[PDB]
């Protein structure tokens, strides 16, 4: 509680590849960990203009930014100052698959992310390579302990240009760098949105709102 | 709206098999479709005492019983008097897999279910065949239209005897027997509970509470 | 010694696909040591089948596989008491079937009791639209797990007008008595509908199968 | 004609497993028409590797496969321009790896640029605990999809003290120029670590591979 604040900053670099084509993106942002709200500005540094839907990247750009009620243990805020890392697979219904990692540290009032992102087997005529996505729908992540660490699974869906949805299943493993108290089974509602972007997504402004809860009584 | 009521009745028969061993269960219940609450009493008629965790069956024992706000189209209540059917696969993390169908009709104030349930590849030393499950956790189902019908996917988890969770992914397809208005992407929170049961689950009293919503703003 | 060079087969399958029930009976003959068999199948209920017959055919016994002397034959050892199998068949478009077969022996005739169930086949997919031509030949991978025998296979249906539709099989085989367990091995398969009438009310089906150990070193 | 009976190989792989980065370089030689190859691999960064080396080895070219005259050889046709591949490797305990290889040709030497990433390997699983012995031999199933070549394979690692750990491979192969496309076919494989030092800093790896058409009729 001594290393967290109502207003915190964020710096990140992501290095990655999709279908074997490499890229890099850097980001600067800020957020309110107790309000579960954050935003950031992202710039493509290498590999631009990106030949795939930017939306596949956005959830890689920290569950610290989620409003936790007092009756649910907060694995993430506990993990600082040491921080935590996460690993994630994102399996799309047409066989496209991405995996990503984020190592999160803290310097003063600024979270620092080192992100790797890789994706393969996206069909050339699919919504990802043809940039036919509109946005992620809001979601509810299911979090539970497994082997002394925290898992989070979520059914995600991208709405598509001209209607319909493109589904993806997320499986995330979260690992605190120190021993923290482990939570009971719980949920985090999310809503991630690209608020603005330039024509080729070289510049993107991204927002997330997230709140933990215990489901129906 | 002429064939629905604040209080409705339910009759069902399920015929099925798990790992090749057949069984049959009948049920009688009642519920409040606008409150999203229901309960029923279930009796094993054949194949008892069941050699597997009763919990795998319980979600087969109707999304009519979910509280829908006025701003979300209600695919289910619209579908009557003709009714609707559903198909579901339930894929467990240890390779166990169940599929089920329910054809739902309506007679007076009573819903009538014809249910088939089949499951295979449950390991002999797994939580299902060793009856090590405690209950399903509450959940949030994600519902979206695909090919003119309604899909519902949910990350489910069974809490286990002595701690931890056993995960299962549900994919349901819902099919109205007449043309109804299709909803936008939305959610249904659920909480299913066995309220009471006898020693070998020959008799079970089952409750569900469910409410639709639109996620975080 | 209860296994003769020429043996007979009788079966009944009861099943449902997308909730629509059907029943099929079969009479055949095969040569266990040659790994070849054939049979005539008749739809008894639910005809004309509204789905691709090909999804059913591998449900219609690894006794009919030529094993070399240097590979333990789990199947031929299991008689006269017999064995059962359970199988999930997961199609790439989300269609999923599960099946069971209880196999017994009466004189020189194998008797099969088969249950088959399938759900979530899209209305416009190759199964509901009857766009399949045949299964490609395949190589099943077999290995022991928990004292029983597993067999996994990548299957593909060739499609009318070109291309393939993929399905992953996961089978569990369970001898009714204790038999000697094999090392990791393979069975090559080729299953074919040799003839059928217009609506597949009558089908003549053949299979050739041979076990092997793969490439050496 | 740019394909000679004896050819050389040079590669560099950069990667990460559970977020921990590493780099490996390789020098080898093979006989494209005999379907045999071998190579010496050296960890350059990230050593000693904290995970089972076996997960990496299939990333270290189907040019090295003996094709019969009656099967179109997608790989040998693709040179001198070369081809690339993308692959997902989904392990039965939820561990998942994805890899890419861009293959070019310089004189008589193939050059590989490989990226490898893996996540969600459980701390107590056979990969993180180094409990693997070797890959079993396998049969890859290859088929055209969207004008490119797919190859799927059921793989198994034998485990220290018995049993197997399963992995499903899905590979996409992409020629850099237009080549003639093959019919559905198979490639049998056998990959082996022939020697290694204590911490796998040095590894000698061999593969034998032969294409075929499966059982006839």
Describe the protein.
Four copies of one chain form a homotetramer. Chain A is an all-beta fold. Chain A has a single domain, classed as Green fluorescent protein (Green Fluorescent Protein). Helix content of chain A is 2%, strand content 57%. In chain A, strands 1-2-3-12-11-8-9-10-4-5-6 form an eleven-stranded mixed β-barrel. The first copy, chain A, starts with 7 loop residues before the first strand and ends with a strand. Chains C and D meet through strand 8, strand 9, strand 10, strand 11 and strand 12 of C and strand 8, strand 9, strand 10, strand 11 and strand 12 of D. The PDB classes it as fluorescent protein. Keywords: Green-to-red fluorescent protein, dronpa, fluorescent protein.
Largest interface comes to: C-D, 32 and 32 residues
Give the beta-strand count of chain A. Answer: 12
Order of helix and strand elements from N to C terminus of chain A:
EEEHEEEEEEEEE
Helix percentage of chain A: under 10%
- Looking at the overall shape, the CATH architecture of chain A is Beta Barrel
Give the number of helices of chain A. Answer: 1
Distance between the termini of chain A: 30 Å
What name does CATH use for the topology of chain A? Green Fluorescent Protein
Structural class by SSE content of chain A: mainly beta
Name the assembly state.
homotetramer
Measured on Cα atoms, how large is the radius of gyration of chain A?
A: 17 Å
Let me know the largest β-sheet of chain A: 11 strands, mixed, barrel
Strand order of the largest sheet of chain A: 1-2-3-12-11-8-9-10-4-5-6
Q: Report strand % of chain A.
A: over 45%
| Overall shape of chain A | globular
What's the CATH H-level superfamily name of chain A? Answer: Green fluorescent protein
Number of domains of chain A: 1
CATH top level label of chain A:
Mainly Beta
InterPro entries (chains A, B): GFP (IPR009017), GFP-related (IPR011584), Green_fluorescent_prot (IPR000786)
GO biological process, one term (chains A, B): generation of precursor metabolites and energy
Binding site for Cu(2+) 2 (chains A, B): 207, 209
Family (chains A, B): Belongs to the GFP family.
